[model samples]
Target: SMPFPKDCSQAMLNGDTTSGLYTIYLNGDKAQALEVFCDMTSDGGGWIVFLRRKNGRENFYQNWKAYAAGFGDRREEFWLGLDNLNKITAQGQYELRVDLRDHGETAFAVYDKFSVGDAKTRYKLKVEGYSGTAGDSMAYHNGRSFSTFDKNCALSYKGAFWYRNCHRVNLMGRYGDNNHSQGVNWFHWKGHEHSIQFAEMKLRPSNFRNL
Candidate 1:
């Protein structure tokens, strides 16, 4: 069964604001979906969300890029079907760690977790960053892209490490144009900063299984 209603919005899942660090435990329950909504008070400010097994067997995360374009609400939603991280059928617990930095803020009301079939099933994961390589320097490619950090997962970002075979992910600029490797690492771009707010990961349903 689902924990909350499927129609709940960011406003509905809101929680209290944290003074930079927060952590929560989703015990004995598998999470099908996760949502995070926040805004930075200034440039070079962003948040990091982490998901890990209680036993430290698996760890996944996503980094929220600093909001330098303007201020409003930056929302991120993720579907955990590809790696079955969404379905925790074991007798153990899962941990969620949220870290807010650089004057960024988020309320508990803006964070939510959904049980199996409770929230809508999502087939992709998305991320936002500064345009070209010059904007952010090191952009982590999630699934199908060339990543130099770790082929199975990349952890240099603000959030959790990403599963390499999880989705068809892409970075914003030319990787090897400078002296960087053709793989996914060191995206050295020397240009003006623009926002690349649309990196996505296509979910693979076949990878999901019942444990």
Candidate 2:
């Protein structure tokens, strides 16, 4: 069976996130769709839903982002959007289906998985949004065409890897930096699960900046 961290149960118990974990035995020629069904209601009147595969070689498969539509105006189900959706479209061929909703009346569903073929690809970020007043909980369905304004990393004081932005560091240090002075570590071609961790740093000095 798949392992979910204990902290995640609160989301599941509250009906905000619907999910499942299981282990099945199979052999060659195993071609069948796995179905997961759920029935839930939201008291707050705005809720989104999705399906994600856990416990696999991380980078090999893209992450799934959930979205909801029609909470504010139109009539549609929630969906995957932004980098997550684009990642699926560009590399997804397997299948990652979902059915969710918002405004207390809707359903969102998807059927497909990420398939990048033999081409060398990288993992993309996943984004989720809930705009109850706007009437939609939607994903971009396109790649991350715009820049982001969120913080995803930090660094130690006077450490080898000192940077104002993790993305900037990633761009500048794709390979290595100053022998052992400081650098980023790219994963192996096939070992998707190998990652040191997310970047989390605290900038020093009163006036540090990045452009």
Candidate 3:
């Protein structure tokens, strides 16, 4: 049921030299879901998408990188959700903001009521390589020791916290890769520019039942 703009070719573009903030209006009553479509021309830059509620709370964040060293394509689609980090129950007007930075050439369109399946059944979050990184930690370290990088990157949803790199550490209490786990969250590196084309998170209604 998500509807897309007819010709996105003229969609707003935030180029390498310019940064932009775009506001989009949504019909919360008729649209049960939301999807974002964008085209990335190169790996030199990146962008972020924010979902803001009427109360002025920008609760959901979608971060992207142009390309990770040797992976990813020039275009992609992202389906963002509000029930997790941001709670939306009433139908009203909401804002979608797109931010472009660092020599990134990006164009985007907002779609609503776009059906992927049962609207009330599940929600998805995705991470792409070449997209970019956020937070503080810049160096990579094993699970045994904590690094600032570890302190910097994380995702919060339904009141639970998930670190971008250490899944095993979250589940087991130690790190090494024995029971390796990584997510689309966020992390930092020192020497090498780490990039990825795709990462994702999916949630069901049951995941929030306790909240």
> How high is the CA lDDT of each candidate model?
0.24, 0.22, 0.23
Residues 73-188, candidate 2: write the lDDT tens digits.
Answer: 11111112232223223421222222222224333322222221111222232223322222221233222222222212223211211122322222112121323212332212
Residues 20-52 of candidate 3 have per-residue lDDT tens digits of 322222332224333323222222222222221
Using TM-score as the measure, what is the rank order of every candidate, best first?
Answer: 3, 1, 2
Give me the candidate number with maximum lDDT: 1
Candidate 1 yields a Cα-based lDDT of: 0.24
Q: Against the hidden reference, what TM-scores do the models get?
A: 0.23, 0.21, 0.23
User: Considering summed lDDT, which 10 consecutive residues are worst modelled in model 1?
Assistant: 106-115
| lDDT, candidate 1, 95-178, per-residue tens | 121221111321111111212211132212222322321333322321122222322333333122233432112232222222
Stronger candidate by lDDT (1 vs 2)? 1
